Every structure is written in structure tokens, then in C-alpha cells.
Amino acid sequence: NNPYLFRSNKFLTLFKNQHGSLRLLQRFNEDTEKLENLRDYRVLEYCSKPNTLLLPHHSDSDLLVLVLEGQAILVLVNPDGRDTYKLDQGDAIKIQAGTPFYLINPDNNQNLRILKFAITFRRPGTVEDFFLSSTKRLPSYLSAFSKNFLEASYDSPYDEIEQTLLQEEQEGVIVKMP
């Protein structure tokens, strides 16, 4: 058939709850040797419904974010402050690899569709997301740190950290806005 065509059913499901979804396009150089020049790029599609927010996480790649439909509140978090952006349909924004961010869908009527073009470099063609929160998918990466290490870092009793940071709250990375 055709090596340059990619139907919507070539997108793998990263996560998908009754609130939204995150899809990942397979590697362009997967089934054909004719797209070797596209091996470092990945396309993802973020889909969510009204009053939902993609939880806090940073990725290991740069992300060209593109709002295909709806409006959004993209909040980029810096170590010395946070930057708020009202993303409107047709707007694009690059998210520096490693910048933690959360996306919010404020409208109560229409859904939100976003295209994230991924530019990989640490491990070409692979994109990873580190969610600071813990769920059924996976638990806050802060939880992998040894008992003693977490106590000295945050200077608090273990059960208290496991109490405030580490335990599972919501069931997915996309939650409904209270």
C-alpha cells in the first residue's frame, strides 16, 4: 500500500479516561525505510472535554503545541515563577523540554483538541512524560526515592510525605475541574 499515509488508527493510546485522551502517532520510520529523516519526530494528539485539566508533568522533548479546536489554559511552570497562557484555536506554542506544565480546558460547552509535535533528542524517536502526581497508570516519580532520601530532602516524617505527596488521589492524569 502506502508508506506516507498514516490513518487515525495508527495512533496508540497513552491514556484515556471518561474525561479525555492522549494519543501517540507511531514512529514515522516504523514500517518503511523511506522516512528515516523523520525518525526524531513524534506526533501526539491531546483530546479532553470541558472543565478538565491535564495534570502536572514535564516531558523529555520539546513540544510544538497546536490547538486544533477549542480554547485552553496552558500554564508553564518555572523554578522562579509560573507563566499563564490563554491558548486560543489556531495558536501554537513551543514547550521547552523539561518545563513542567498543565493544560486546562475552561469552556463548559465544546471539547478541546490539541496537536503536540514532539522533537526528541535524548533518545531519538522516544517521548516520555514524568507526572509528579500518582495514579493507577503510575505513582509520582517522587515515590521512587528511598525512604531516607525523601525524608532528608523534604525534612519531614515519612508518613507525612507519603501522606501529602505520594499517595494516590485521582484515578487518571486528566481530572474534572471542581
Partner: protein, 76 residues
């Protein structure tokens, strides 16, 4: 740092049958650091994007709204 809209500029092509918007690296610093090009295609029903080719860029085309009959010519 601020974001940008794909329609903040006049269409490169804006016929009677269609319109193509394009933001190139020479015009924007965010895309410059990635060496990426973005364009927004808009076409009426029955309209045709005449045969052409791009000299250096490989375009990943995403169908957002509607159906399109595309014809691609390669050499194998």
C-alpha cells in the same frame, strides 16, 4: 515567548477557491530553533490544490476537518 496564531498573517495564497496560511522560520524565532514550518490549508468543496512540490521541507499533513483526495508522486 508569547504564543502565536497561524492566521496572524495574510495568506501566502488566497484564491477564490482556497487559502493557504504559512509561518516560516525566517519570520518566527520559536520555529527557527526547531527548523519547523507550519501552514493552515483552507479549501472550498470541489477545489483543487494544483500539482507542486516543496524544495526542502517534508510536510506532515494533518486532516482536521473534511475529506481530501490527495495524489502523491514519488520515484521508486
Amino acid at each position: 515567548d508569547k504564543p502565536f496564531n497561524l492566521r496572524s498573517r495574510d495568506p501566502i495564497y488566497s484564491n477564490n477557491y482556497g487559502k493557504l496560511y504559512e509561518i516560516t522560520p525566517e519570520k518566527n524565532s520559536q520555529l527557527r530553533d526547531l527548523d519547523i514550518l507550519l501552514n493552515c490549508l483552507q479549501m472550498n468543496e470541489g477545489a483543487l490544490f494544483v500539482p507542486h512540490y516543496n524544495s526542502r521541507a517534508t510536510v506532515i499533513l494533518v486532516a482536521n476537518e473534511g475529506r481530501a483526495e490527495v495524489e502523491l508522486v514519488g520515484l521508486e
